[PDB]
């Protein structure tokens, strides 16, 4: 099977803060399957969080059973949103 930038299991995770990082969303998603990455983004000059990033899985079943359950859950004291991040990442 072809794992490409068009055909990977990568999705967006919003909730994060000046207290939360990629480790904290990885620890909420690691219970579904084996993680490839998580990203947390801020302006490192300004000290200002975007408060989101991406999470990615080694398997599709883990991504889809997560997303269908994840809508409106609470991580690190904040309410979350989930959607796919493949086409916005590919830019096509």
């Amino acid at each position: 099977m072809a794992e490409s930038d068009g055909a990977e299991y990568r999705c967006f995770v919003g909730s994060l803060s000046w207290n939360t990082d990629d480790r904290g969303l990885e620890a909420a998603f690691s219970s579904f399957g084996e993680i490839l990455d998580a990203k947390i983004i801020n302006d490192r000059e300004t000290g200002r969080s975007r408060g989101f990033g991406f999470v990615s899985f080694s398997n599709e079943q883990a991504m889809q059973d997560a997303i269908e359950g994840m809508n409106g859950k609470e991580l690190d004291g904040r309410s979350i949103v989930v959607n796919e991040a493949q086409s916005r990442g590919y830019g096509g």
Side-chain angles (χ1 to χ4, degrees):
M1 312 306 179
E3 302 178 296
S4 79
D5 295 83
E8 61 178 349
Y9 318 125
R10 188 188 300 270
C11 66
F12 167 96
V13 182
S15 22
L16 318 185
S17 71
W18 53 89
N19 290 349
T20 338
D21 296 288
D22 62 298
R23 184 177 175 190
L25 75 93
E26 180 185 68
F29 280 70
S30 183
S31 50
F32 291 82
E34 186 80 283
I35 288 294
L36 279 166
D37 246 308
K39 173 61 57 172
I40 181 269
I41 188 62
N42 77 322
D43 198 322
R44 69 194 65 169
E45 189 289 315
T46 320
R48 185 212 192 199
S49 192
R50 305 296 294 146
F52 55 70
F54 62 75
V55 73
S56 58
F57 285 109
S58 308
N59 318 97
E60 200 171 22
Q61 186 176 19
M63 191 191 68
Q64 294 292 0
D65 279 355
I67 290 171
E68 198 63 63
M70 276 295 179
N71 179 20
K73 294 295 181 187
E74 291 170 79
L75 269 59
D76 201 44
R78 289 271 291 166
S79 190
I80 86 172
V81 176
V82 287
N83 67 353
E84 64 76 36
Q86 170 279 303
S87 196
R88 299 296 79 72
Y90 185 72

